[PDB]
Ligand binder design. Sequence first.
Ligand SMILES: Cn1ccc2c(N)ncnc21
Length: 167
Amino acid sequence: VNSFSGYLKLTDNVYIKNADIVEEAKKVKPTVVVNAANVYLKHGGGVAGALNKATNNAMQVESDDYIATNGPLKVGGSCVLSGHNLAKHCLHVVGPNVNKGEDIQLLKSAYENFNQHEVLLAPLLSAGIFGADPIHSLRVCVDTVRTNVYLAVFDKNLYDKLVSSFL
Ligand SMILES: Cn1ccc2c(N)ncnc21
């Protein structure tokens, strides 16, 4: 049993809810919240800007030290950092950004990072300002992630479309 509430069940391991990932993290304090990161961990907008704002910029300070030591992530890659006031850990995952021309085939590689964690609160990747089709992102999620994932969809309109169209 876990603390996640109000999720509609899609598969054995994937759950979905119309939710503000920030508000959900604050309420649940999950072991892992996933950030929709870029390779520079520059948390300016979207899931990353909202998560970072909720940490009072501590996520950005920690991320800048990580990049100064390690250099940029790979598209499709991830790193584990603090969850600050939102979660135990934040898994920063880089999905391909269509609005920068990245290979959408890298979306499956991105979601494979989730399999290193038994339970996660996560947004869809490559959705929103990363420019991918969220219906596609949900299909790749279901077909890739084997661990238990709780998806927070920000848009009510999009949430209803993802559920209604789910195969
Ligand atoms: C996709 N996207 C963008 C903002 C956002 C949020 N606050 N929660 C979940 N997903 C989100």
